[PDB]
Amino acid sequence: VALXPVALXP
């Protein structure tokens, strides 16, 4: 995932 400026998992 992308959450705004960061990537966490996919």
mmCIF file with all atom_site columns, N, CA, C and O in Angstrom:
data_model
loop_
_atom_site.group_PDB
_atom_site.id
_atom_site.type_symbol
_atom_site.label_atom_id
_atom_site.label_alt_id
_atom_site.label_comp_id
_atom_site.label_asym_id
_atom_site.label_entity_id
_atom_site.label_seq_id
_atom_site.pdbx_PDB_ins_code
_atom_site.Cartn_x
_atom_site.Cartn_y
_atom_site.Cartn_z
_atom_site.occupancy
_atom_site.B_iso_or_equiv
_atom_site.pdbx_formal_charge
_atom_site.auth_seq_id
_atom_site.auth_comp_id
_atom_site.auth_asym_id
_atom_site.auth_atom_id
_atom_site.pdbx_PDB_model_num
ATOM 1  N N  . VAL A 1 1  ? 0.864  -1.196 0.000  1.00 0.00 ? 1  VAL A N  1
ATOM 2  C CA . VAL A 1 1  ? 0.000  0.000  0.000  1.00 0.00 ? 1  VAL A CA 1
ATOM 3  C C  . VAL A 1 1  ? 0.896  1.240  0.000  1.00 0.00 ? 1  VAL A C  1
ATOM 4  O O  . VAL A 1 1  ? 2.099  1.150  0.346  1.00 0.00 ? 1  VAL A O  1
ATOM 5  N N  . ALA A 1 2  ? 0.399  2.341  -0.588 1.00 0.00 ? 2  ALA A N  1
ATOM 6  C CA . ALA A 1 2  ? 0.936  3.664  -0.335 1.00 0.00 ? 2  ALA A CA 1
ATOM 7  C C  . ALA A 1 2  ? -0.075 4.439  0.468  1.00 0.00 ? 2  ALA A C  1
ATOM 8  O O  . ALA A 1 2  ? -1.266 4.455  0.153  1.00 0.00 ? 2  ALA A O  1
ATOM 9  N N  . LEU A 1 3  ? 0.411  5.077  1.532  1.00 0.00 ? 3  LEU A N  1
ATOM 10 C CA . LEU A 1 3  ? -0.380 5.932  2.373  1.00 0.00 ? 3  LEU A CA 1
ATOM 11 C C  . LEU A 1 3  ? 0.271  7.306  2.385  1.00 0.00 ? 3  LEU A C  1
ATOM 12 O O  . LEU A 1 3  ? 1.183  7.551  3.158  1.00 0.00 ? 3  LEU A O  1
ATOM 13 N N  . UNK A 1 4  ? -0.169 8.188  1.507  1.00 0.00 ? 4  UNK A N  1
ATOM 14 C CA . UNK A 1 4  ? 0.458  9.469  1.404  1.00 0.00 ? 4  UNK A CA 1
ATOM 15 C C  . UNK A 1 4  ? 1.907  9.287  1.081  1.00 0.00 ? 4  UNK A C  1
ATOM 16 O O  . UNK A 1 4  ? 2.194  8.646  0.068  1.00 0.00 ? 4  UNK A O  1
ATOM 17 N N  . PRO A 1 5  ? 2.858  9.817  1.832  1.00 0.00 ? 5  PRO A N  1
ATOM 18 C CA . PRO A 1 5  ? 4.253  9.739  1.445  1.00 0.00 ? 5  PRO A CA 1
ATOM 19 C C  . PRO A 1 5  ? 4.967  8.456  1.741  1.00 0.00 ? 5  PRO A C  1
ATOM 20 O O  . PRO A 1 5  ? 6.177  8.386  1.480  1.00 0.00 ? 5  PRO A O  1
ATOM 21 N N  . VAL A 1 6  ? 4.337  7.470  2.370  1.00 0.00 ? 6  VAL A N  1
ATOM 22 C CA . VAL A 1 6  ? 5.057  6.259  2.753  1.00 0.00 ? 6  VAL A CA 1
ATOM 23 C C  . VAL A 1 6  ? 4.394  5.030  2.183  1.00 0.00 ? 6  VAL A C  1
ATOM 24 O O  . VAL A 1 6  ? 3.184  5.027  1.907  1.00 0.00 ? 6  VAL A O  1
ATOM 25 N N  . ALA A 1 7  ? 5.161  3.996  2.050  1.00 0.00 ? 7  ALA A N  1
ATOM 26 C CA . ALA A 1 7  ? 4.726  2.685  1.605  1.00 0.00 ? 7  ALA A CA 1
ATOM 27 C C  . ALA A 1 7  ? 4.739  1.752  2.785  1.00 0.00 ? 7  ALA A C  1
ATOM 28 O O  . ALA A 1 7  ? 5.733  1.707  3.540  1.00 0.00 ? 7  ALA A O  1
ATOM 29 N N  . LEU A 1 8  ? 3.707  0.967  2.946  1.00 0.00 ? 8  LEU A N  1
ATOM 30 C CA . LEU A 1 8  ? 3.647  -0.016 4.014  1.00 0.00 ? 8  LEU A CA 1
ATOM 31 C C  . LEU A 1 8  ? 3.022  -1.264 3.455  1.00 0.00 ? 8  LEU A C  1
ATOM 32 O O  . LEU A 1 8  ? 1.890  -1.243 2.933  1.00 0.00 ? 8  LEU A O  1
ATOM 33 N N  . UNK A 1 9  ? 3.743  -2.374 3.519  1.00 0.00 ? 9  UNK A N  1
ATOM 34 C CA . UNK A 1 9  ? 3.292  -3.555 2.794  1.00 0.00 ? 9  UNK A CA 1
ATOM 35 C C  . UNK A 1 9  ? 3.100  -3.219 1.354  1.00 0.00 ? 9  UNK A C  1
ATOM 36 O O  . UNK A 1 9  ? 3.972  -2.568 0.805  1.00 0.00 ? 9  UNK A O  1
ATOM 37 N N  . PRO A 1 10 ? 1.991  -3.581 0.703  1.00 0.00 ? 10 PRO A N  1
ATOM 38 C CA . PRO A 1 10 ? 1.847  -3.344 -0.718 1.00 0.00 ? 10 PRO A CA 1
ATOM 39 C C  . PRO A 1 10 ? 1.121  -2.043 -1.029 1.00 0.00 ? 10 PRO A C  1
ATOM 40 O O  . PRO A 1 10 ? 0.752  -1.856 -2.202 1.00 0.00 ? 10 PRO A O  1
#
